Design a protein around this ligand. Structure first.
Ligand code: HEM
Ligand code: CYN
Length: 184
């Protein structure tokens, strides 16, 4: 089960958020973690193209060297709250798993700067609610969360100390492909 009470930013600025640039996950909190331990890396690039909000996702496993991409067309529920119907693709846009009814995730932008953000995301993969996920994003992969995001984490009734840092997972990102999957 997920949470749908996550509160979107008051005066959230979408022209800055959706600029087609890359956001890196530097810290996160999984409320329903897998039974098998896993080092995780992820980044995304939210932007627009052809007239729609697009979001490109990236996951990497430094251990297995695994990598997978996704691209979705976003639909605005309210500013700050979005629903994404994703499709798994190769780094060049070739579709591995088409868009599907049961497949989608919804995220809420709880806080956002020109350099940082705090989001809540809920993944549904075929009618199954896959659980609550809170992520701390930064436009720079090597920066520690600032006082503003951390105040936002606290304002959400969470503890940052319960967050896990990806800073030490020997991550590797593909921003070139991330930015180009935006038009795919
Ligand atoms: C930046 C926010 C994130 C978003 C929007 C997001 C969204 C998703 C999406 C769309 C998928 C499905 C991929 C597919 O099969 O096509 C997925 C799978 C997965 N994500 Fe993320 N994710 C995020 C961050 C992370 C982080 C930080 C972790 C680490 C806890 C994580 C761990 C996983 C794992 C282990 C899977 C595979 C599960 C499966 O294939 O059913 N994700 N994620
Ligand atoms: C990914 N949850």
């Amino acid at each position: 089960k997920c949470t749908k009470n996550a509160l979107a930013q008051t005066g959230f600025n979408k022209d800055k958020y959706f600029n087609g640039d890359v956001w890196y996950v530097t810290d996160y909190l999984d409320l329903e973690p897998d039974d098998v331990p896993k080092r995780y890396c992820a980044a995304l690039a939210a932007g627009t193209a052809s007239g729609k909000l697009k979001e490109a996702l990236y996951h990497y496993d430094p251990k297995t060297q695994d990598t997978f991409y996704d691209v979705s067309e976003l639909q605005e529920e309210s500013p700050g709250k979005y629903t994404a119907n994703f499709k798994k693709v190769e780094k060049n846009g070739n579709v591995k798993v088409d868009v599907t009814s049961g497949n989608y995730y919804t995220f809420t932008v709880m806080y956002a700067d020109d350099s940082s953000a705090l989001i809540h995301t809920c993944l549904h993969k075929g009618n199954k609610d896959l659980g609550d996920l809170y992520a701390v994003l930064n436009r720079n992969k090597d920066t520690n969360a600032g006082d503003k995001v951390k105040g936002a984490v606290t304002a959400a009734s969470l503890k940052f100390s319960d967050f896990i840092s990806t800073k030490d997972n020997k991550c590797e990102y593909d921003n070139v492909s991330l930015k180009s999957l935006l038009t795919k």
